[PDB]
Design an enzyme around this catalytic site. Sequence first.
Site, PDB file in Angstrom:
ATOM      1  N   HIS A  43       0.751  -1.257   0.000  1.00 44.12           N
ATOM      2  CA  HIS A  43       0.000   0.000   0.000  1.00 44.12           C
ATOM      3  C   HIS A  43       0.781   1.308   0.000  1.00 44.12           C
ATOM      4  O   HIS A  43       0.399   2.251  -0.686  1.00 44.12           O
ATOM      5  CB  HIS A  43      -0.984   0.047   1.178  1.00 44.12           C
ATOM      6  N   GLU A  79       2.838  -1.968   7.465  1.00 39.07           N
ATOM      7  CA  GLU A  79       3.764  -1.854   6.349  1.00 39.07           C
ATOM      8  C   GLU A  79       5.027  -1.099   6.727  1.00 39.07           C
ATOM      9  O   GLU A  79       6.113  -1.456   6.282  1.00 39.07           O
ATOM     10  CB  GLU A  79       3.063  -1.224   5.144  1.00 39.07           C
ATOM     11  N   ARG A 131     -22.580  12.029  19.490  1.00 42.94           N
ATOM     12  CA  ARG A 131     -23.020  13.265  18.856  1.00 42.94           C
ATOM     13  C   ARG A 131     -24.470  13.006  18.431  1.00 42.94           C
ATOM     14  O   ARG A 131     -24.792  11.929  17.906  1.00 42.94           O
ATOM     15  CB  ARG A 131     -22.157  13.592  17.625  1.00 42.94           C
ATOM     16  N   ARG A 183     -15.913  20.818  22.994  1.00 42.52           N
ATOM     17  CA  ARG A 183     -17.367  20.805  22.902  1.00 42.52           C
ATOM     18  C   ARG A 183     -18.070  21.065  24.229  1.00 42.52           C
ATOM     19  O   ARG A 183     -19.284  21.269  24.251  1.00 42.52           O
ATOM     20  CB  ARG A 183     -17.853  19.479  22.306  1.00 42.52           C
TER      21      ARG A 183
END
Lengths: 218, 250, 250, 218, 218, 250
Positions: B5, B77, B165, B220
Amino acid sequence: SDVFHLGLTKNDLQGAQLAIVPGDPERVEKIAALMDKPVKLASHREFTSWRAELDGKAVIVCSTGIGGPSTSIAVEELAQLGIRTFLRIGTTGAIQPHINVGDVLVTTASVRLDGASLHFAPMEFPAVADFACTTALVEAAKSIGATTHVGVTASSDTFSMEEWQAMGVMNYEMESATLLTMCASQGLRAGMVAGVIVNKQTESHAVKIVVEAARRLL
Amino acid sequence: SDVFHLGLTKNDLQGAQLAIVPGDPERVEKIAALMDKPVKLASHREFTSWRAELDGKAVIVCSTGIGGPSTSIAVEELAQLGIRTFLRIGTTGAIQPHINVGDVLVTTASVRLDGASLHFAPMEFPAVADFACTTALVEAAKSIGATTHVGVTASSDTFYPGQERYDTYSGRVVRRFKGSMEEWQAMGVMNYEMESATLLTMCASQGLRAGMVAGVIVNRTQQEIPNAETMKQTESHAVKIVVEAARRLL
Amino acid sequence: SDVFHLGLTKNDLQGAQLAIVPGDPERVEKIAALMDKPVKLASHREFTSWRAELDGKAVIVCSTGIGGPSTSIAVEELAQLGIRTFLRIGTTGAIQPHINVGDVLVTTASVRLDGASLHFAPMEFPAVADFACTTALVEAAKSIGATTHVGVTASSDTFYPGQERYDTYSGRVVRRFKGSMEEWQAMGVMNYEMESATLLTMCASQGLRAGMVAGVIVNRTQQEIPNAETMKQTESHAVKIVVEAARRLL
Amino acid sequence: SDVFHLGLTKNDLQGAQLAIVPGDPERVEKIAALMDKPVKLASHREFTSWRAELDGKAVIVCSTGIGGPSTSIAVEELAQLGIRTFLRIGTTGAIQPHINVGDVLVTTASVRLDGASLHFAPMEFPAVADFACTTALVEAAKSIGATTHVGVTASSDTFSMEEWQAMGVMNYEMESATLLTMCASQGLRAGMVAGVIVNKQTESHAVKIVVEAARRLL
Amino acid sequence: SDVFHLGLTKNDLQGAQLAIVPGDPERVEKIAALMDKPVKLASHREFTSWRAELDGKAVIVCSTGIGGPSTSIAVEELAQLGIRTFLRIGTTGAIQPHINVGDVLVTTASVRLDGASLHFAPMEFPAVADFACTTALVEAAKSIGATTHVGVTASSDTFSMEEWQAMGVMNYEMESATLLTMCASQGLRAGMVAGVIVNKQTESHAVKIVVEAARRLL
Amino acid sequence: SDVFHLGLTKNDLQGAQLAIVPGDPERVEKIAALMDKPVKLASHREFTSWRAELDGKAVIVCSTGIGGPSTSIAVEELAQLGIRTFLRIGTTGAIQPHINVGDVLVTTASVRLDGASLHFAPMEFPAVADFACTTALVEAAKSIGATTHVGVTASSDTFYPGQERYDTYSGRVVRRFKGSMEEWQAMGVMNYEMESATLLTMCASQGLRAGMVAGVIVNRTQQEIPNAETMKQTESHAVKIVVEAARRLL
C-alpha cells in the site's frame, strides 16, 4: 471508625494523601520501617495499616489481602479517608527470557483478566498506571542501580500464557488490574512495581524503591 | 515497492527506524520541513510519505488516514520496512471543561471503542503507550512551555455515534453509546479520536514502541468558540513537540 | 505443610472430610469451641484453621478471607487435604424490606457477579448449592426456631459499586451496575456477599458439596438501625445453625 | 462547509438524493465519467466527491476511504446533505469454487466482523441491504449480460474462513457491514455490488452496473 | 379468553395455584388421569390444558410445547391466571456412568445454554429451582422407592459435553433453563423432575412422582 | 418414517423440494387446499403435514410450531427429506404506526433475539432471506394488490419480555429489553415474531433458500382495534400470496 472495614478515622491519617498498598501485613511492617515515625494504626481481617512520614509528610501503608475484591475495599476506604495516590509493590515471577531474578518491573498497564475491574469500567477501558507514579518508580529504581523493565503485566483472579509472552507481557499477578482500573477511572493516581523472584533481597530493594518513589510524589 | 500500500521500498527509508504518523497527508510535508533534508518519498491515496534527517538519523513521516483499518495498514507496512518507533501527532477536541484550546494532550492509554485493535490483542489487553515515547513527548511539551494533560483518550470507530453526537441525520445514538460521554468524562477521559486504539494495541503487542500527542483545537464542553486560528498556532506547537520528542528517541 | 497457603499437612485434619468456612479468622475459634476437643491447627494470613470433633468425627473450621480469589485458594487447598463438604457461615445485610435483622438466610444459588468462579465453569453454569447441605442448613435453622429465608444471593467482586453503593469517594457506579440493586430486588434476590459465587461454582463443578447460611445483621432498605447487638446474638445463632447442620452431614 | 469533513454544502448537491460510494478517488472519477455533466466538487483527506446527472437528476459520487470508520463519516455527512440512497461498488476476490473472475456479486447482507457497525446497532441486528437497491443491482447486471451471484459477504476491519466458505459466504471486504447496518438502522437505503478480480474490465462492468442501478433508483 | 394463547379464563382454573407442565399433550392426559375429577379445558396449538384435583384443591396440567420459547408463553399466561407454583416432568437420557435407566433425576439448577432465559435475567443469574419444590420431588420419589439423583441439568435450544460430564452435569434437555430462570426471577416457585430412559414405566413413575410432589405443595 | 419427529418418509413428499411452513398446524390444510390434489400426510404434535401439487410439481405444507427450537426440528427434518426452499407464512402485529392492519410484510432479514439460530451460525452472521424467495413474495403481493412493506423483523425467543410487553404477571422487563421496542422502532423494524431468526439463519448458512411473508392483523401502536375479521381476510390474502410466490419458485 469512619470506614466499614479498615477501622480507621480521617484523623488517624494526619493529612496523609499517599498510601503504599502491598498484599500482606509482613510486607507492610517492612515498608513502614524504612520511613520516619512508623506507627501501627489498626488490623482488621486482611487490612493491617500503619502511618509513617517522608520529608515531614504523613504516608499510609496498608495491606490489601489477596485479589481484586479485597484490594478494591482497601483502596476505596483509603480514598474516603483522603488518599489520592496509591503505590503497590509486590514480588512476582517473570515470563520473558530476558528478565532476570532480581530485576525490577514497573507496570505501565495491565491485561484485565480479573472480575473486579469490570465493577469500575467496561473492558474497553485501559487498566493504565498514572504517568507521575510510573515515572517516580522508574526514577527510584534507577537511583539505586536496579535493572528495570517497564511494560505490561497480566492480572487475573486465579493463582493463554504463550500468547501473553508472545505479546510482550512481563509477568503475572492478581491485583494490579483492579488497582489501576479503579484508580484511573476515578481520579486517583496509581503506580505498580514488583521485584522478580523467579522466572528477600529483591523484595527489600523493591520495597526501598516504592518508598523512594512515594517521596517523589508527596 | 516491497509493501502493498505505501508504495515504498526498504531502501527508501535509508535505514530509518522512527516514524511520525499524522492522520492527514496534508500535514506530512509540514512536519518533514521541521527537520533536515526533507524529501517526498511517495503518495498513494491517504498514504503520503516523506523522509528527513534529525541529528544524523533518517526519520519517516507518513500519514495514516482515518480510522483503525487504514492505520493498521500504515503501521504494519512501516513496521515491515523497519520502523520500530511510532509517534502519532494530531489535533483533537477535548471533553473535559478544564482542558483549554491550545493545551497539549499526551496519551498514556486509550479506551478501545474500535474493531481493528481486536485483531492484534483481545479486549483485556491494554491499548497502552510505550513509556519512553510518552516520557519523550511529555518532556518535549514542557520544554516548549505548553500546558500539558497526560492521561486516557477514547478511541472510537466512528466520529458521530461513538462520540455520542446527536446533531446528525437520525439524531439517534444506539444504546451502547447513550450516556457514554458523561461516563467517559466522569472517568477522567481527556478526548476522543479514532486511530490510537489500533496504533497503541498493535505496537504494544508486537514489541514496537508508540506514543501519541495532540493539540486541542476545540472543546465541545465550553461555549466559547475556538479563536480564528482554531488550528494553526496549536497545530504548529504540536508538530514542534513531536519532532523534539523524536529527537530524544533516536 | 502439603499445601502452599494454609500451612497444613493432611495428617493435621485427622481424616476430617467436612469444613465450616467463615470469612473472618476471628470467628474461627468461636465456631470450633461449639464442638468437642477444639485445637488451633495453624494461622497464616487470613487463613486461620482449627480442628474439632463432632459426634466422633473430625471437623475443620477454616477462614477464607475476603473475595473469590482468596476463597478459591482456601477451598482448593482444603479439598487437596480431603475436605469434600464445605459449609460457609457468615453475617450479611439484606436487600429485601421484608427480611429482618436476626433472620437467617440459606442460599440455594448465587448470581455470579465475580471473576474467580469463571475459572471453574463458564457463566452458563449455575453457582448452585448442594441439596443435602441446603436441606441440613434449613432443618438446623428450623430446629433453632429461626425465621428463615431460602433463596438467591448476589455474589459480588466488590463491596461498593457491585452492590450499587453511592456513598463512596467518587459517588459513581459504572453502567453495568447502575440500577442493578432494584433489578436484583425485583428478582427476589435476598442479599449481597462476596464469596459464594466462587465457593458454590467450584464445588458444584468438582464433585464437592457446599452450602451457605448467614445471619442478617443489617438491612439497608429499612431505616431502623440494627439493635446495639447489631451482630452478637444473630452471629451466635448462625454459628449454632451451621454446627448443627454439619452434624447431619457427617 | 455544512459538514465536518467532506467540504460540501447542501447547495453543492443540487437536490441529489442518491450517492455512489466507492473506496478510492480513482474509482470515483471513472464512475462520474459514465454519467452526464460530471463535475468535481471537493477533495479533503480520503473524501473526494463529484456531482453528475442521470436522466436529468443530480447524483453524487464520493470515495469512502479504507474501512468502516471513514465510510461511516462519508455516509453520515452525505445523509446530512440530503442523500437517502447509497450504492457501493468494489472489486474483491471470491471464496466459493463456482464463482469465476469477472462475475458480479450483489450482497444481500454481510457478516458483521467489523467494529463500526456496532456503533449503529447491536450485533443481533442484520447488516441487510435495501430490497429496492439489491433488485436494481441485479437488474442492471442482467441488462449487460453479467454473470451474477447474490448472497452474503463477510466484512471485517483487517486486510474463520473455511467456516465462512462452508456457510456460503461469497467474498470478503471491509466496508459493507458498516454501510449496510448504518443505513438499514437509520432509514437509509443501501446496496452493494462487486466485481470478482481473483479467487480492470470486471471493474469497468461493475462500475457500469452500479451507475445503471442508480438510474433505476432515482 | 383472558390470555393470548392458552384459551383459558381465570374461572377455568377454579382457584388452582399449582400447575404441572410437561412438554406434550399425551403426557398431560396421563398426569391428569392420576388425579381427581380430571377435566380437559382447552387445546390451542402446543398448549393442551386440563384441570384436576388433589386433596380437594384444583390443579392445572398444561403442555409447554418444544423449547424455552413456547414454555415461556405457557408459564407466563398460567401465572396471569393465578398459578404460582410450576412443576415440570420429562423423560431424558443421562450422561453420567453411575446413572441407570429407570432412575429419577431432580434438578437443583440448570446450565443456561438456551436463549429465552436471557429474556428474564442476565447470564450471571442462576437457573435455580425452588427449595420447597425440589424437596417435594425428592420426598415423593423416595416415597415410591425410586432411585434418585439430585443435581445439575444442561438445558439448550438444540435437539461441550465431555466438559459437562466432567462438571457433574446429570442430563440434557431443552426447557428447564427457561422454566427455572423465569420463575426464580419473578417470584414463582418451580421444580424439575425427569425419568431416565437412556444413557414407559420410568415415565409412569416420574409422572406419579410429580403428582405426589404437587400434593405436598398445595 | 425416516425422520425422528415429522413421521414422514422421503417417499411421502413425492419428490417435493419446496415447503410452505406456517407456525400453526390449524392453518396447514387451508393452505394446502389452495393447491391441487391436497392430501394429509401426517400429524404429530404441532407438526401437521400435507402434500399438494402446483403446476405439476409436488409441494409440502408443514407447521413449525412456536419458537426457534421447534422450528429448527421441522426445518432440519424437511431438509433431510429433500426440501431446499422454505416459505414461511404467518400473521403478525406491527410496531410501526404507519403500518396498517391488512398490510403485508415481506422480511429481508431479522434481528436475532433468539437462541437456536446461534447453533447454526455465530451472531455476526445475518439472518437474511434468500433473494429469489423475497422477490417472489414481493411480486406475488403486488399481483394481489396488497399494501406491502419490505424490511427488517425482530425475531424473539419470548412473546412477552422480548417484545417488551409490561401487561404481565410481574410487570417487569429485564435490563436488556427495557426500552428495546422504541430502539427497534427507531431503526425501522416492522414487527416482532418468534421463528424467523432460526429459519433464515439455518437456511442461509446451509445452502437452502428461505423467505417470509406475513399479514398484519394488529398494531399495538394504534389505538384503533382490528376489525371483527381481525384475522380472516388478511390471513386469506397472506396465504394467497405465499402460494403464488411458491408457484414462481418451483
